[PDB]
Amino acid sequence: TSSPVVVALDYDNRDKALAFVERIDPRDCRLKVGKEMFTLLGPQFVRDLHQRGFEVFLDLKFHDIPNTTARAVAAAAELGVWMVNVHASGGARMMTAAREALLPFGKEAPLLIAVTVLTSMEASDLQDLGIMLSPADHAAKLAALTKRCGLDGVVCSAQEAVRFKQELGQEFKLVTPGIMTPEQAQQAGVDYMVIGRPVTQSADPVATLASINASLNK
Amino acid sequence: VITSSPVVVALDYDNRDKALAFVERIDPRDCRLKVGKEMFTLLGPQFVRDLHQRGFEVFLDLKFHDIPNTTARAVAAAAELGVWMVNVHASGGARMMTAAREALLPFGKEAPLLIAVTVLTSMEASDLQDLGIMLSPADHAAKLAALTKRCGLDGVVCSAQEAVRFKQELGQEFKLVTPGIMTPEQAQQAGVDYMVIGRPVTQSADPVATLASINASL
Numbered sequence: 001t002s003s004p005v006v007v008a009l010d011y012d013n014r015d016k017a018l019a020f021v022e023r024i025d026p027r028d029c030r031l032k033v034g035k036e037m038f039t040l041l042g043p044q045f046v047r048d049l050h051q052r053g054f055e056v057f058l059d060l061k062f063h064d065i066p067n068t069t070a071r072a073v074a075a076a077a078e079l080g081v082w083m084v085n086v087h088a089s090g091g092a093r094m095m096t097a098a099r100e101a102l103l104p105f106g107k108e109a110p111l112l113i114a115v116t117v118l119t120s121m122e123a124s125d126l127q128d129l130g131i132m133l134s135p136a137d138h139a140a141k142l143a144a145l146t147k148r149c150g151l152d153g154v155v156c157s158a159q160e161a162v163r164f165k166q167e168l169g170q171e172f173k174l175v176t177p178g179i180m181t182p183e184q185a186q187q188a189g190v191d192y193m194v195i196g197r198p199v200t201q202s203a204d205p206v207a208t209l210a211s212i213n214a215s216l217n218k
Numbered sequence: 219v220i221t222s223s224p225v226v227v228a229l230d231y232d233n234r235d236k237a238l239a240f241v242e243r244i245d246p247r248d249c250r251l252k253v254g255k256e257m258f259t260l261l262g263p264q265f266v267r268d269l270h271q272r273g274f275e276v277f278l279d280l281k282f283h284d285i286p287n288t289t290a291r292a293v294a295a296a297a298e299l300g301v302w303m304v305n306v307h308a309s310g311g312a313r314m315m316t317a318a319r320e321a322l323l324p325f326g327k328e329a330p331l332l333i334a335v336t337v338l339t340s341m342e343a344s345d346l347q348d349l350g351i352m353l354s355p356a357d358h359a360a361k362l363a364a365l366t367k368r369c370g371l372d373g374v375v376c377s378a379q380e381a382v383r384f385k386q387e388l389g390q391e392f393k394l395v396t397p398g399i400m401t402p403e404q405a406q407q408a409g410v411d412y413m414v415i416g417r418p419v420t421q422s423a424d425p426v427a428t429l430a431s432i433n434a435s436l
């Protein structure tokens with residue numbers, strides 16, 4: 001697909017999940033598999049989506065020692081996923097090890113994206129941890145580290161996309177976490193946008209996606 | 219059938235047959251098992267079920283680090299899977315750890331031990347500085363361990379080098395899990411409750427005899 005849309009599958013049941021996926025079409029969007037779904041269903045669920053033609057963002061936010069994170073990212077590449085993420089809080093050596101583990105996969109390597117600051121973190125949450133920079137500023141610091149380590153991009157809200165494209169450049173991918181419309185967020189510089197209930201709770205998911213996609217550059 | 223051993227053997231295989239060949243050699247009276255990010259990404263929760271069916275208690279070592287509600291749902295998923303221990307990153311902050319604690323309350327005494335990673339064993343001061351953390355690994359770990367205790371979690375992952383300090387500061391009931399210069403016997407002397415051991419057992423010539431030699435010293 002050339003759509004920048006990535007639909008979040010936040011189901012707690014495999015029946016419902018694949019009932020939705022049956023409705024829509026892989027030519028129209030990609031899919032995100034997060035921590036709960038994966039913990040409940042495992043990589044077989046990812047294989048189910050691949051067998052249905054979809055490209056998948058595996059959103060497990062790996063955060064471990066460098067060698068383990070590298071092996072996990074390589075495991076995800078062996079699963080065939082399109083995108084995988086790690087925590088930039090794991091540090092430069094961890095992010096570098098993950099990048100090097102994907103080198104041999106060549107053009108089959110998933111996009112390797114870092115989480116910087118979680119959307120839930122406020123300054124009071126950060127200060128407990130010894131962090132005195134604001135969420136946005138700490139995120140900018142971790143995003144610069146991510147780029148220096150050669151990763152493909154970061155998870156970044158649409159509200160920070162202009163700042164981050166300016167500071168980090170056009171090639172460095174911005175993926176939203178999942179107020180701007182999709183077209184506004186694309187204008188801000190978002191490369192891939194995660195969309196959840198607007199699509200999965202739509203009475204007509206295909207028509208919701210068709211109208212979203214009609215508003216976006218491809 | 220519960221082990222008296224404090225040993226938890228890390229299953230870091232890239233192949234199910236090799237892992238289960240190991241698991242068949244050993245016995246659940248002699249150790250617990252740890253399932254981490256690599257094997258869980260390859261095999262998912264069915265692999266945990268296969269270990270349970272063989273009578274083992276399992277440390278599900280996925281180091282959950284996400285927004286509070288997502289981490290809570292993942293921790294509850296692990297509890298429904300029936301695992302013995304599960305961990306989270308203290309770096310996710312207090313509200314995330316509290317959310318995870320609250321998610322386990324409905325599971326009561328069947329809930330897994332809920333343990334926080336503080337500082338990863340791989341991290342040196344220079345790795346932390348890049349993140350804006352100016353404390354030594356040991357002192358940042360102590361800060362995050364205090365926060366973990368204040369949030370009501372059951373213990374932390376901590377090196378044996380810091381166990382005497384942590385038992386003094388945080389008390390006897392607060393569990394210390396080493397991640398794997400101190401011998402198992404010394405680690406136990408220093409107050410370690412559970413010790414993860416990986417390649418020294420799984421990659422040894424004779425893993426059963428290696429594990430026996432470790433248990434004989436404990």
Ligand SMILES: [Mg+2]
Binds near residue numbers: 082108109110
């Ligand atoms: Mg690809």
Ligand SMILES: [Mg+2]
Binds near residue numbers: 242243244
């Ligand atoms: Mg046997």
Ligand SMILES: [Mg+2]
Binds near residue numbers: 244
């Ligand atoms: Mg046996």
Ligand SMILES: [Mg+2]
Binds near residue numbers: 302331
């Ligand atoms: Mg238990």
